[PDB]
Design a protein around this ligand. Structure first.
Ligand SMILES: COC(=O)N[C@H](C(=O)N[C@H](Cc1ccc(-c2ccccn2)cc1)C[C@H](O)[C@H](Cc1ccccc1)NC(=O)[C@@H](n1ccn(Cc2cccc(C)n2)c1=O)C(C)(C)C)C(C)(C)C
Lengths: 99, 99
């Protein structure tokens, strides 16, 4: 699909058999979901953008279905105010900036 | 152009005749620039990021030339680590997400 930006680009994603909203964020290197439950082992990592850093848990090779497209990659989990799909998954579905 | 995301989408922008580097950020409501001077009167504002919040100065009706495409609008100046082009400008150069 083509998505204009007059509104925040929130799109259905499915993970672990669940539906959630998430933000396609080309300004973000990684993907970061609100606190949730995930299988596998995880490593603590520290991220920060505007306004400081937060301690997030890193899972590797997690599958997420974004707008119906399958992508497998790292996903960060911590106290973000919004689920964030970053470029590490955005590449997987062949998403680009057009104009 | 059709910009992939294997790298952060850093492009060249032109403001008040000056050239700078900005990150095309679909995950940003607002455009936020690195401390600079801009004509006119500003209103104080709060913007929340991933870490937490920062306070920035709001300038209105600002001309800015993004990759050869003129767009006018609200630009926030504040202690940001990088110049951020937000949706309020991206819509203006007809930018969209496509996958
Ligand atoms: C409505 O609130 C907003 O729009 N907030 C905006 C915002 O923060 N938007 C989005 C999150 C978001 C989005 C929505 C909400 C929100 C809030 C309330 C209600 C609803 N939604 C909350 C948070 C995220 C925004 O892209 C920033 C842009 C950005 C890029 C670079 C440096 C600083 C800021 N990305 C990051 O912070 C990412 N980051 C940090 C560094 N790098 C790599 C890097 C390293 C070195 C150098 C460079 C260039 N990059 C990343 O990938 C993180 C670590 C968060 C993954 C902003 C910019 C205006 C504060």
């Amino acid at each position: 699909p083509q998505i204009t930006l007059w509104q925040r680009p929130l799109v259905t994603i499915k993970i672990g058999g669940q539906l959630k909203e998430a933000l396609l964020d080309t300004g973000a290197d990684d993907t970061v979901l609100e606190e949730m439950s995930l299988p596998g082992r995880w490593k603590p990592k520290m991220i920060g953008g505007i306004g400081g850093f937060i301690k997030v848990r890193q899972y590797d090779q997690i599958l997420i279905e974004i707008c119906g497209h399958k992508a497998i990659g790292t996903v960060l989990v911590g106290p973000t105010p919004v689920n964030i799909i970053g470029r590490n998954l955005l590449t997987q579905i062949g998403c680009t900036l057009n104009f």
